[PDB]
Structure formats: structure tokens, C-alpha cells
């Protein structure tokens, strides 16, 4: 089973590619995905008081699913690495938002790790 | 089609996770995969004269497919992100080795990018 091998990986993986300012992320637990992570020009990288609380919505033309952390970090171009079909859409959207919030928070931790 | 969305991503993505010394890679062209990338204790990070020329083999107990760059960099725990079944095994193994050699070479470029 491929899904089990994912479990050998750390839950959140932060990625980059040469020649690219945009970054990338892989989420290795359900719902598993690859996503692009981009940053507003005025992104600070300072952790907020309350936990991260972003929104998933359809944006741009054509409308594409995207995640706005509300802190300057975006996730887009999602690719689901599971082949199942989620029974409940509301549940699936919710589980995906919660994974994005953690990824966003995990990314803010990168900067504070480096200051230490 | 999921495969086409992969094409929006840069071919090779280099990853890390907090709390982990091992690193990660995602290859976004055929054959697409996620892999763990690890390093001998005496890894230098200096580019070689001739191109990278690693080997894929079965290693460890139980025997697992792994890639040895012969330069200190390893790839293991491969997860194929395509669901097809390769017609020819020799061809498939070969295409995978060639992707690993580029990934290894792309990783050596990370260090020389940073020196510049
Ligand atoms: Mg617009
Ligand atoms: Mg950052
Ligand atoms: Mg041994
Ligand atoms: Mg390195």
C-alpha cells in the first residue's frame, strides 16, 4: 500500500526549487497533497497571537481552489495524492483547511527556528 | 487530469521538515515520485567533473529499492506518484535512475548557488 509508505515521511514537508521564488509543500497525512506556496510582497513571517485561521475559496479566472492564510502566505495548484473520492464534501473541505492552517503555522516556525 | 497539473510545478523540488536532518525531494515529471534524501556523514557537496552517475539497487533488510549517488547522497522510500504500470521494467528502472542523477546534480547546485 502506497498510503502506508507516506507514513514514513514527516507530516509536512517544505520545498523549494532552483530559479523559483515561489515555494512548495507536501502534506503526507490525509488529505495528502502537493501544493504551491506563495507570499505577498509584504509578508513578514512573524507568528500571530491566535492560531492561524485561513480560508479556502475559489479565486482568479478561471476559478481555482486556493488557500489564503490571511497572513500573506497562499497555497494553490493543489494536487491530491490520494485517489479516493471523499464521501462528504463539507468534511473534506474542512480537513483540508485544517491541514493548510498547520502548514501555514509550520512555515512561520521555519523563520523562528532560524532566529534561534 | 492530475498529471497535467504536475506540469505547472518545477521538475525537481527540494524539501525539508522541521526536526529532521534527512531531506526530501519530489520529482514532478515522469516518473513522478516523492523520495527521502539522506547524506553520508562525510558528504562534501562539491560538484564532480563527470556527470553524476548513481546506481539503483535493492538494499538493507528487507531489501528496499534505493538510489546511491556514489557521492554521499541517497534517495530511498520511493513513492511513485503515477498510478500506471510501466510496460517495460528495464525502461522504467532506467528512466528512474536518470531522474535520480539529475536530482543529485540539482542538489549539488544548491550549495554552489549559496556560495554565489
Ligand atoms: Mg485577478
Ligand atoms: Mg518562509
Ligand atoms: Mg545494513
Ligand atoms: Mg545539501
Amino acid at each position: 500500500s502506497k498510503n502506508n509508505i507516506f507514513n514514513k515521511y514527516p507530516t509536512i514537508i517544505h520545498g523549494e526549487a532552483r530559479g523559483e521564488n515561489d515555494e512548495f509543500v507536501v502534506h503526507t497525512r490525509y488529505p495528502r497533497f502537493l501544493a504551491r506556496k506563495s507570499f505577498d510582497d509584504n509578508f513578514t513571517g512573524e507568528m500571530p497571537a491566535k492560531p492561524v485561521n485561513g480560508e479556502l475559496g475559489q479565486i482568479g479566472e478561471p476559478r481555482r481552489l486556493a488557500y489564503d492564510s490571511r497572513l500573506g502566505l497562499w497555497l494553490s495548484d493543489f494536487i491530491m495524492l490520494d485517489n479516493n473520492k471523499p464521501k462528504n464534501m463539507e468534511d473534506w473541505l474542512g480537513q483540508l483547511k485544517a491541514a493548510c492552517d498547520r502548514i501555514a503555522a509550520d512555515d512561520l516556525m521555519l523563520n523562528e527556528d532560524a532566529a534561534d
Side-chain angles (χ1 to χ4, degrees), chain A residues 1-84 86-116:
Chain A
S1 167
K2 287 182 155 57
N3 257 275
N4 292 343
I5 306 182
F6 277 106
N7 292 161
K8 295 182 67 158
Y9 286 73
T11 306
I12 293 161
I13 292 180
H14 295 291
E16 59 182 353
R18 303 182 51 250
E20 289 258 10
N21 266 4
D22 290 342
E23 295 173 12
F24 307 87
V25 72
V26 179
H27 182 242
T28 59
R29 304 286 181 273
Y30 187 80
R32 298 171 169 87
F33 61 80
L34 172 64
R36 174 175 297 257
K37 70 167 175 184
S38 41
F39 300 85
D40 292 345
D41 283 349
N42 285 323
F43 174 78
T44 58
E46 181 65 313
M47 197 61 199
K50 294 246 159 143
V52 170
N53 203 311
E55 179 64 295
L56 291 170
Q58 292 286 296
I59 70 172
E61 310 77 38
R63 295 154 188 104
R64 294 276 173 253
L65 172 68
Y67 168 79
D68 178 352
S69 69
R70 294 283 192 248
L71 298 163
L73 174 168
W74 299 75
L75 303 166
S76 55
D77 289 339
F78 284 102
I79 307 182
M80 301 302 131
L81 301 174
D82 304 296
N83 249 281
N84 82 326
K87 306 169 62 147
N88 202 335
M89 180 68 162
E90 219 199 11
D91 293 341
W92 180 81
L93 275 176
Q95 284 166 313
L96 172 64
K97 165 207 162 55
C100 294
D101 293 333
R102 294 190 54 239
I103 290 169
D106 192 71
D107 176 280
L108 266 28
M109 300 313 304
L110 280 184
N111 305 7
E112 185 141 356
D113 283 341
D116 305 349

